[PDB]
Structures are given as structure tokens and as C-alpha cells.
Amino acid sequence: LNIGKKLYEGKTKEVYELLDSPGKVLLQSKGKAAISNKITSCIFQLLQEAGIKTAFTRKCGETAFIAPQCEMIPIEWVCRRIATGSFLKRNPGVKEGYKFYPPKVELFFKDDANNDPQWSEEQLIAAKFCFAGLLIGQTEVDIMSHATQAIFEILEKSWLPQNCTLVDMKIEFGVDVTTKEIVLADVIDNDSWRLWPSGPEGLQMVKKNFEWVAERVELLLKSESQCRVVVLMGSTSDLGHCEKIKKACGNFGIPCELRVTSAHKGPDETLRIKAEYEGDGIPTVFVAVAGRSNGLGPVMSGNTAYPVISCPPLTPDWGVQDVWSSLRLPSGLGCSTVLSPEGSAQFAAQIFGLSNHLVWSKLRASILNTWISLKQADKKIRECNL
Amino acid sequence: LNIGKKLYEGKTKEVYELLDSPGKVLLQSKGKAAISNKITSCIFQLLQEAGIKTAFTRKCGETAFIAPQCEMIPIEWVCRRIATGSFLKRNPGVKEGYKFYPPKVELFFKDDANNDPQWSEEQLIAAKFCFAGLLIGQTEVDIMSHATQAIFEILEKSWLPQNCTLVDMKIEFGVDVTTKEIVLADVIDNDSWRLWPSGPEGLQMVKKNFEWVAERVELLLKSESQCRVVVLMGSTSDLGHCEKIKKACGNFGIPCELRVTSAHKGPDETLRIKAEYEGDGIPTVFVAVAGRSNGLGPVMSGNTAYPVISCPPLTPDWGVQDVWSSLRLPSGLGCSTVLSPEGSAQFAAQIFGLSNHLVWSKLRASILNTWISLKQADKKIRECNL
Numbered sequence: 086l087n088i089g090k091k092l093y094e095g096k097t098k099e100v101y102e103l104l105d106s107p108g109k110v111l112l113q114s115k116g117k118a119a120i121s122n123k124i125t126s127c128i129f130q131l132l133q134e135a136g137i138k139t140a141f142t143r144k145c146g147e148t149a150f151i152a153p154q155c156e157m158i159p160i161e162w163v164c165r166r167i168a169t170g171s172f173l174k175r176n177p178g179v180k181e182g183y184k185f186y187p188p189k190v191e192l193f194f195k196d197d198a199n200n201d202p203q204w205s206e207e208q209l210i211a212a213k214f215c216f217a218g219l220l221i222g223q224t225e226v227d228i229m230s231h232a233t234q235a236i237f238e239i240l241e242k243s244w245l246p247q248n249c250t251l252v253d254m255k256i257e258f259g260v261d262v263t264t265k266e267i268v269l270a271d272v273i274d275n276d277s278w279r280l281w282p283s284g285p286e287g288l289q290m291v292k293k294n295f296e297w298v299a300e301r302v303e304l305l306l307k308s309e310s311q312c313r314v315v316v317l318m319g320s321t322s323d324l325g326h327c328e329k330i331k332k333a334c335g336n337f338g339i340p341c342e343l344r345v346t347s348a349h350k351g352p353d354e355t356l357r358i359k360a361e362y363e364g365d366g367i368p369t370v371f372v373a374v375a376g377r378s379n380g381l382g383p384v385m386s387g388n389t390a391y392p393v394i395s396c397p398p399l400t401p402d403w404g405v406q407d408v409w410s411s412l413r414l415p416s417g418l419g420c421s422t423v424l425s426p427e428g429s430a431q432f433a434a435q436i437f438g439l440s441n442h443l444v445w446s447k448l449r450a451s452i453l454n455t456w457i458s459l460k461q462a463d464k465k466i467r468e469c470n471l
Numbered sequence: 472l473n474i475g476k477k478l479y480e481g482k483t484k485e486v487y488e489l490l491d492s493p494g495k496v497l498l499q500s501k502g503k504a505a506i507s508n509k510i511t512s513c514i515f516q517l518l519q520e521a522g523i524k525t526a527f528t529r530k531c532g533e534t535a536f537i538a539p540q541c542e543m544i545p546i547e548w549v550c551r552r553i554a555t556g557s558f559l560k561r562n563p564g565v566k567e568g569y570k571f572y573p574p575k576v577e578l579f580f581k582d583d584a585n586n587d588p589q590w591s592e593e594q595l596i597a598a599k600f601c602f603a604g605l606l607i608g609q610t611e612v613d614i615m616s617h618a619t620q621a622i623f624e625i626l627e628k629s630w631l632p633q634n635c636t637l638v639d640m641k642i643e644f645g646v647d648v649t650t651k652e653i654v655l656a657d658v659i660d661n662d663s664w665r666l667w668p669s670g671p672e673g674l675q676m677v678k679k680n681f682e683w684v685a686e687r688v689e690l691l692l693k694s695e696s697q698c699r700v701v702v703l704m705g706s707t708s709d710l711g712h713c714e715k716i717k718k719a720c721g722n723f724g725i726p727c728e729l730r731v732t733s734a735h736k737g738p739d740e741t742l743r744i745k746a747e748y749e750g751d752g753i754p755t756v757f758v759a760v761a762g763r764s765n766g767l768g769p770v771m772s773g774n775t776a777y778p779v780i781s782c783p784p785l786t787p788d789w790g791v792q793d794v795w796s797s798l799r800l801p802s803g804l805g806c807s808t809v810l811s812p813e814g815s816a817q818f819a820a821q822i823f824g825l826s827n828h829l830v831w832s833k834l835r836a837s838i839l840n841t842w843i844s845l846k847q848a849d850k851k852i853r854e855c856n857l
Contacts, residue, residue: 178594185593206562207571 087112093157095257097121097272103151108263113159113272114149120286120299121274122148128240128273134306135239135443136450137232138260142269156216160209161193161201162229163329164237165253170277172253175203178187181233182285190230196257206230219267224464228260228267228457235453236269240278240450242442243305249293250283275299310440313367314341314433317355317385319375326398326426328375333430335351337447339437341430348381355381359389368440370391370433372396373420377403378410386420392436395422396429408423473498481643483507483658489537494649495528499658500535503518506685507660513658513688514626520692521625521829522836525620525841526645526656538684541656542602545593547579547587548615550623552638555665555676558639567670574623576616582643592616601647604735605653610850614653614843615644621839622775626664626771628828628835635679636669652684659683696826700819702717703771704741705761707731709831712812713760719816723833725823727816734767741767746776754826757817758782759806759832763789764796772806778822781808 089112090102093389097118101108115121122144128269129141129150140152165172188448194204206214206226214221233256241251253394255277282293314334316327327343334341346355362369371393373382382395395411411422423429431448474496475490483504498661508530515527515536526538551558554569580590590598592612600607604664619642625635627704641663661681668679700720702713713729720727732741748755757779759768767779781797795810809815824831830833 126692174592178590178597183593183597204563204564207569211564211566211569430820467648 090303097274102154107154109151109153111294112145112151112152119147119293120295121272122150123189123299124274124278125272126150127306128389129269131305131446132236132239132244132269132450135446136454137236137239137259138268138454140268141424151294153261153263153268153269155261155268155348157257157259158216158221158229158267158272160204160229161196162233162256162258163191163193163253164233164256165189165191166241167250167252167281169252173245177361180182181358188234190233192230196366198235201416206246212295217262217265218262219241219265224460225267228460230452231456232258232269234265235449239449242445244280246309246442247301247304247409248282248284249301250279250281250290252279254298261297272279278339283298297429299428303338305442308441309317310437310444311367312339312441312444313362313369314339314372314430315369316341316343316357316372316374317381319345319349319379319381323374323376326396329371330374330396330430333427337430337434337437339444339445340433342408346381352384353383359385360439363389363391365399368437370394370436372429372433374398377407382411382422383414383418386414386418392433393420394429395420396426397424401422404443412437473577474584478729481657483660492541495537495539497540497807498531498535498537500622503681506681507658508536509685510660510681510688511658511663512536512690515646515655515689516656517629517832517837518622518625519741521832522691522840523622524652524654524840526647527762530833538656539646539654540648541654543643543656544600544602544607544615544653545581545583546590546643547582547616547747548619548642548644549577549579550619550642551575551577552623552627553636553638553667556640557564574620576619578616583719593767603648603651605646605651610846611653612841614846615817617842618644618653618655618839625832625835628831630666632695632828633687633690634685636663636666636667636668638678641687645720653766665772691828694827694829695825697753698725698823698827698830699748699755701748701760702726702729702760703732703744703767704729705733705735705767707762707763707768708761709784712782713813716760716782716816719813720819721824723816723830723831725816725820732767735760738770741770742774745771754823756780756822758815758819759786762852763793766796767792768797768806768808769800769804772800772804778819779806780815780818781806783808783810784810784812785810 088104092100092102095098096113097115102111103112119440122386126144133139133141142151142153143151164186166188168179170180173179173181192204193201207274211221211228217350219225228343236256244251250310256269256273257271258267260470277296278428280293281299316330318327331343333340334395342359346358348355369391371385371391373393373395374386375381377396379397386393397407399407423432434444434448438448473549475488478486478488479485484499484501487498489498490600512530513524519527526541528537528539530536551571552574554565555567559565559567578590580588593644594614596608605611622642623640630637642655642659643657643746644653647654661684662739666679666684700755702716705711717727719727730744732744734741755777757771757777759779760769762784765783768779772779783793785793800806809818820830820834824834
């Protein structure tokens with residue numbers, strides 16, 4: 086049903102304990118506060134589906150949402166693509182509009198409504214903070230800045246179709262008391278970011294009002310770009326190879342179908358099947374899987390205007406001899422080769438990602454998370470250099 | 472004889488024109504100013520011999536030195552390895568002693584004895600400065616910061632043998648009016664850097680006084696570590712290959728000798744020659760050059776405690792078959808392989824560099840300069856994307 090104790094809170098919400106369910110044992114509650122919760126519930130669900138570790142479970146009512154319990158980091162991370170207001174005042178000379186390409190990440194010391202300054206990434210490390218048991222140093226500070234930039238880009242991309250420019254945003258992290266992971270732990274409403282109208286060009290430039298932002302955010306959870314990956318295999322004995330591609334495609338939310346066809350045996354049939362994927366208007370990418378001399382990829386590519394990846398099921402036995410039938414093609418063939426089965430699915434994702442922000446986001450989160458993972462393995466092996 | 476007009480000047484020297492010799496048409500003149508000139512004359516000659524582009528020609532008298540004429544950049548570049556004084560005051564929290572590893576580079580706006588603030592690398596670009604025709608932007612600002620760090624490390628290394636720790640330094644650049652290159656254009660005396668005694672440990676930590684620094688700086692121009700590269704070739708028909716290595720070694724100031732010996736023909740003789748390089752105490756690195764089945768490298772490595780590089784003179788005719796005789800050696804052989812002739816000389820340099828700061832410096836300057844070159848080619852091809 087619902088319970089609750091006391092606990093902490095921020096400026097927009099009040100965090101409460103939740104007996105009858107420990108861990109995610111947290112409830113955020115807080116006119117227009119219901120708008121602020123609708124926004125923060127989408128951005129979170131969005132960033133979460135993309136792959137970003139974020140403190141959010143399910144939406145709750147109109148002005149609430151439960152999320153895992155965690156100790157907050159007293160720092161305000163801000164990311165910019167364009168310099169405006171405050172920044173200008175702090176950085177004399179930078180004319181408004183200056184675009185930052187990496188883009189710029191700055192963090193502000195303790196949120197304290199007093200002066201709450203700007204800390205150097207080095208003053209945070211020397212701060213030697215520790216929450217939920219996690220001592221915050223190089224590794225952790227590096228994760229948050231990287232994750233902030235990643236979260237920025239994801240939202241920046243997600244907004245573009247609504248014709249909105251993410252100028253800059255503010256975000257706070259927190260260590261999950263259970264998993265001990267640094268997570269995007271606190272609400273993101275219309276005062277967490279700044280969205281130009283981007284159809285330097287419009288009025289004096291006015292951030293979208295929480296009202297307009299409100300009735301658009303749910304649209305970021307869906308994409309206009311449809312996409313499909315069709316896997317063609319010359320022989321069912323490679324079914325396993327094709328399934329790794331299919332499963333991989335599943336990780337990037339891209340629908341994928343497996344099919345059996347032989348350029349060598351049923352030339353005519355291969356073209357036929359090609360036609361029914363071409364004629365139905367769904368943007369498609371073909372992945373050709375043919376062992377030995379691969380004539381499947383070459384033929385497909387030569388008869389379709391869509392991309393064609395040859396992903397040969399090589400084994401070290403004769404692999405070195407077979408790949409060349411996939412590389413070395415007669416002129417006029419765009420056909421590309423990718424040896425890794427999941428790798429080919431990833432490439433396909435990156436192809437569709439150019440049009441589907443939801444896919445792009447998953448690629449981006451993944452890039453980040455892989456870095457997070459690298460970072461941790463090094464710290465774990467570093468322990469053993471004593 | 473000598474002439475001169477008016478021109479500009481800094482805080483320690485007064486730059487004068489020099490009729491009878493345009494371009495390098497500059498003279499720096501300025502008790503203890505003679506000390507300041509002796510110091511700045513070595514550091515310059517040092518950085519110059521290492522490969523750093525620096526505004527310095529020859530020393531002149533006791534309190535002067537001529538250098539090429541150039542327009543100065545109104546910025547003070549500072550590099551730190553350890554945080555102290557000023558920095559601490561500017562960065563609250565960073566306890567004294569904090570080591571910066573990249574290490575830290577900061578630049579201060581216009582030298583103006585007024586407030587002469589701290590500029591962001593982005594405020595300098597937006598400053599849109601232009602000297603001697605060179606508009607200063609991304610590329611140029613990036614060169615100076617990189618060059619500053621490189622110059623730091625070189626001097627940091629150069630000092631170590633005198634048991635001195637380079638804590639931080641200040642440096643100013645300038646565009647050479649002739650070549651148009653950004654060069655380390657202005658004096659480096661004892662007020663340009665800070666040298667601990669490094670034998671947190673000594674007194675309250677006192678920078679060396681210009682007197683002690685003075686009678687040590689000339690020692691940085693020489694090294695304690697002797698080094699020699701001996702090139703063994705199984706056949707004089709590879710003489711050309713060996714000479715590229717020799718010439719390359721010449722670029723890193725390492726003496727190199729070529730010799731003829733055959734593991735297959737004169738086994739006994741090869742060992743003999745090996746012995747006369749081992750017995751004379753000069754730290755040596757052996758580079759084995761043997762075509763076809765290379766038994767020279769393998770044998771050398773197995774009979775000497777010094778390093779042995781196999782640098783096969785491969786050609787695409789049978790290269791793919793020959794390299795394996797240099798790779799794939801029976802156990803107990805440290806023998807390493809390096810295909811590029813100059814590349815093998817470079818590796819040898821990096822080996823000796825671990826002990827000869829003069830060599831290390833040349834390696835470092837080279838790393839930098841290659842980056843400078845990459846940077847410029849991209850900017851030159853970028854022009855053609857209009």
C-alpha cells in the first residue's frame with residue numbers, strides 16, 4: 086500500500102523511507118509540482134532505457150516517484166554546449182553563443198545556498214568524501230564528469246526532434262546504498278536545464294517554459310525512425326552465429342529477422358526475399374552470413390540500395406582463406422565486412438542510430454558504461470600492486 | 472661589431488634592434504643581472520639542443536644575448552608538478568604538495584602589472600590575438616600549452632641529477648617575425664621557476680638562491696651517462712640499412728659504430744667483437760642486422776647481458792618469410808625486434824634515455840614537434856574544406 090519514515094530531501098522533493106520494501110525504500114514527493122514530477126519521470130525512464138545508471142524505479146502518483154535509496158554527493162554537475170548567463174559573467178571574453186565541443190563540464194561545491202562556489206576536479210578529490218562506504222577520489226570523480234557529459238549528449242540528442250537546443254544542464258549524483266554505484270540520483274525538471282527554441286536567431290532567446298516542456302517530454306520516449314536488421318544465412322548450420330547477431334540487435338532495441346537463402350543455390354529466391362524487405366518501406370540493413378566463398382554478401386549489395394554487411398562465420402581452421410571472398414569484391418560494391426557477430430549488430434545500430442535517437446542513446450550509454458567498467462577493473466587490479 | 476635601435480623590453484631585459492644583421496636583429500641587455508643572463512643562456516641552449524623552438528641565437532657578453540626578433544604573446548604560461556604558494560591560495564582544499572601528473576598548465580592574461588588575471592584557454596582564443604601576422608586560435612593556443620608542458624618536463628629531468636625538484640615555472644612565447652613560429656621567446660632566470668632541494672622533508676622548503684642555481688646550470692648541458700650503439704651486419708650489402716640506423720642515432724646524439732660479422736660464418740669472431748664492447752665498460756646496445764634467416768641477433772642476445780635489437784632488412788619479396796627467424800626464438804632470449812631502421816635507433820635512444828637526460832630531452836622535444844607538425848598539416852588541409 087505505502088508507508089514511510091523521515092529522511093532527507095532537496096529543493097523540489099522530500100525523500101521518505103519506505104518500510105515494506107527496503108533499498109528502493111525511497112519516495113520523492115512535493116502550483117506545478119506535478120509537472121516537475123512528470124518531466125523528471127520521463128527523463129529518468131529515458132536515461133534509464135538508454136543504459137545510464139540512474140536512481141529511479143517507477144513513477145508514483147502525480148507528484149511522486151520511488152527510487153533506490155542512496156547517499157547524495159554534495160556537488161552540482163553542470164554541462165554546457167553553449168555559453169550563456171552565469172558562465173559569461175564568470176568567463177570574461179567568451180562571447181555569448183560560444184560552442185563547447187567536448188562539451189564543457191564544470192562542477193560546483195556543496196549545494197549550500199550560501200556561496201556554493203565552483204570546485205576544481207582536484208579539490209573534490211582532496212575533499213576525500215565518502216558516502217554509503219564509497220570513498221570518492223580520482224576514479225569516482227572521473228566517472229561523474231564522464232557520465233554527466235554522456236547524459237548531456239543523450240538529452241541533447243533526444244530533444245533535437247522537438248526542435249529544441251539543450252544549452253546546458255545541472256545534475257546531481259549519489260551512491261546507491263545497495264549496489265554502491267554512483268547514479269544520476271536526483272530529479273531533472275525544467276530548472277535543471279535550459280532549452281533554446283532552435284528552429285543566435287530568434288528573440289533574446291527564451292528558455293522553454295515548464296508548460297511547453299511538460300507536454301513534449303513524453304515524445305522523447307519514442308522515435309520517428311523505424312529500423313530493421315535482416316540476417317541472411319546461406320546455411321542453417323550457422324543459425325547459432327546469426328542468433329548472436331539477433332540477440333545483439335535486441336540489446337539496441339532493433340528488430341531483427343533471420344532468414345535462409347543461398348546466392349549459389351537459389352539466386353532467384355535471394356533476390357525475391359530482398360524485394361519484400363525493400364518494397365515494404367521499413368528502413369533496413371542486411372547482414373550476410375555465408376561460410377566458405379561468400380557470394381551472398383556480394384550479390385545482395387549489388388542488387389539493393391540499402392547497406393549490406395558481410396559477417397562471415399570464420400573459424401581458425403580455414404578462416405584466413407575465407408575472409409578474402411568477403412573483402413576483395415568487384416567494383417561498384419559498397420559491401421562492408423565485420424567479423425564479430427555482435428560487432429556487426431553494433432555497426433547496424435550505429436547506422437540506424439544516425440536517425441533514431443533512442444538507438445544513438447543506447448550506443449552512447451554503452452560507450453560510457455564500458456569506460457566505467459574499464460576504470461573499475463584497473464582500480465581493482467591496482468589494489469594488488471601493494 | 473654591434474649597432475642597435477630602440478624596440479621593446481620586459482622586466483629583466485631590454486630588447487634592441489641590430490642593424491648589420493636583420494631578423495636575429497635583436498639584443499637582450501640589462502647587482503646580479505649577469506647571473507640572470509648566464510642562467511637564461513644555458514636553459515635556452517639546453518632547450519634548443521633538445522629540439523625546442525626557442526628565440527635564442529648566441530650568448531653576448533656577460534649581460535646580453537642575441538636572438539631572433541619576434542612579437543611576444545602577452546600571456547604568462549605556468550606549469551606545475553607540485554602545488555605551492557599562489558596556487559594554494561587560488562585553489563582552496565589542495566593541500567601543499569599535491570602532485571599534478573600530466574602536469575598542470577595554467578596561463579595568465581596580459582602581463583600588465585595591474586591585476587594580470589588568469590585566462591581560460593578559451594578566453595585566449597576568443598581574444599583573437601594576432602602577432603607577426605599569426606592569428607592566434609585553437610591550434611596556436613594548443614601548441615603553447617603543449618610546448619610549455621614539454622619544456623617543463625625537459626627542465627624537470629635536466630635538474631634531477633643536481634638533486635633539484637622543479638616545482639613550477641613561468642614562460643612566455645612569441646611569434647618569430649621571420650619564420651612565423653611560436654617560440655619560447657623570453658628569458659628564464661631564477662625568478663622564472665622554483666627549485667626545491669629534494670635530496671615534504673627538508674626545511675619549510677626554500678627555493679634555491681640565484682647564486683647556487685647559477686653555478687649548476689652549466690652542468691645541465693652535460694650527462695653522466697655514456698652511451699653507444701653498435702650495429703652488427705652479417706653482410707656489407709646491407710651497409711645502407713645500417714647507415715640509416717647510424718644517422719638516426721646521430722639525431723639523438725648517440726655515438727654509433729657499424730661492424731661486419733657473421734654468426735653463420737665467423738661464430739667465434741662475432742663473440743670476440745662482442746667481448747671488446749662489453750669489456751670496455753661503455754654502456755652499449757647492440758642492433759643486429761642479418762638478412763634471410765637471422766642467427767646473428769639470436770646468438771648475440773644469448774651471449775651478452777646488454778640489450779639486443781634485431782632490425783632485419785626486409786623487402787616485400789620474402790619479408791613475410793624472414794621476419795619469423797627474428798621473432799620466435801628459443802627460450803631465454805630477451806632479443807627484441809624492430810623493423811624500422813630509424814625506429815630501432817629511436818628505441819635504442821629511449822633505452823639510453825632512461826639514464827641520459829640529454830637524450831631523454833631530445834626524445835621529448837621530438838614527441839612535441841611531431842605533434843606540432845600534425846597540428847599544422849590538419850590546419851593546412853582544413854583550409855581546403857571550403
